[PDB]
């Protein structure tokens with residue numbers, strides 16, 4: 019279910035601006051955690067959390083040209099599967 | 108009774124690094140506030156706060172050759188009278 | 197008058213406690229906020245009412261009206277009655293309280 | 300298991316309110332930081348022990364073991380034991396806890 023529609027709004031070569039349909043009224047969660055790492059798995063994944071009232075997040079400091087995998091989770095898996103996406107900067 | 112021993116460690120013509128004996132582990136207050144202003148009173152004094160676990164502070168943005176009245180206040184007056192000192196940059 | 201802020205602080209905790217059962221372990225926004233909001237309002241009314249009312253009359257009234265108004269909500273938003281031997285076990289917990297406070 | 304974290308939150312609160320009576324207007328940093336840690340720990344210990352034991356059941360045992368562990372702590376270290384013919388009232392709270400227990 020939540021979240022929905024994880025899209026990259028702005029995309030500087032070193033920063034991705036991601037938003038998501040946070041849900042509604044009752045399905046609003048307290049915090050989202052967002053994971054971004056290299057798409058080849060050569061490294062582990064970086065990770066931050068964001069207050070659950072906000073539905074956007076700024077992922078800064080990447081490497082240009084490289085494709086990335088952006089994941090957005092919920093506090094628990096009881097809200098649904100994580101909506102993971104990709105983007106080449 | 109607290110805090111105690113307000114003095115100026117380092118003193119540039121425009122800055123006054125001040126410290127104070129916090130006390131002991133079981134007698135730390137949540138915060139202090141530092142009041143520094145011109146010793147005469149041509150304008151209001153300057154004011155800020157410092158977390159209570161720290162015991163030193165640095166006052167910047169002063170005018171050289173001028174003497175100042177630095178006063179440190181506890182969170183409340185229960186902890187005793189505020190300690191005030193004077194220093195000429 | 198201070199007995200009216202009492203129930204206002206009792207009922208506020210009564211609500212926030214039931215909103216806490218709804219917050220999924222503080223992982224659902226709005227039920228997590230409401231619990232934080234309620235326990236603030238139930239704290240502030242407690243200060244205005246125990247500012248000068250005895251802290252044994254206020255506790256016992258809270259410990260009883262609260263032991264009822266949240267169990268009737270737990271049963272209103274679910275049920276369970278006496279899952280384990282006795283509901284009276286909570287009625288006599290409420291009794292042993294009212295004698296180390298008032299006696 | 301559920302009656303383990305219920306009492307663990309009672310201990311956190313009992314120390315939470317006491318460390319608050321020691322500190323002034325939340326002003327003494329060390330005992331005040333204890334209260335916030337004691338409260339925030341107990342706040343999350345109750346939310347978890349609430350999904351297993353009904354709300355009204357835990358609320359009872361909560362208020363029960365509280366004043367138990369409060370007057371037991373009031374007399375053990377501070378003194379008081381006022382209304383000494385109330386240790387029967389401590390045996391009463393125990394019995395009610397027992398006949399709702401496992």
Ligand SMILES: c1ccc([P+](c2ccccc2)(c2ccccc2)c2ccccc2)cc1
Nearest residue numbers: 209235238239312338341342345358361365
């Ligand atoms: C952390 C701190 C305080 C409470 P409680 C409480 C009472 C009844 C049921 C659950 C929790 C409390 C207060 C005083 C003594 C014992 C317990 C609490 C918190 C806010 C307002 C009212 C009561 C809980 C967790």
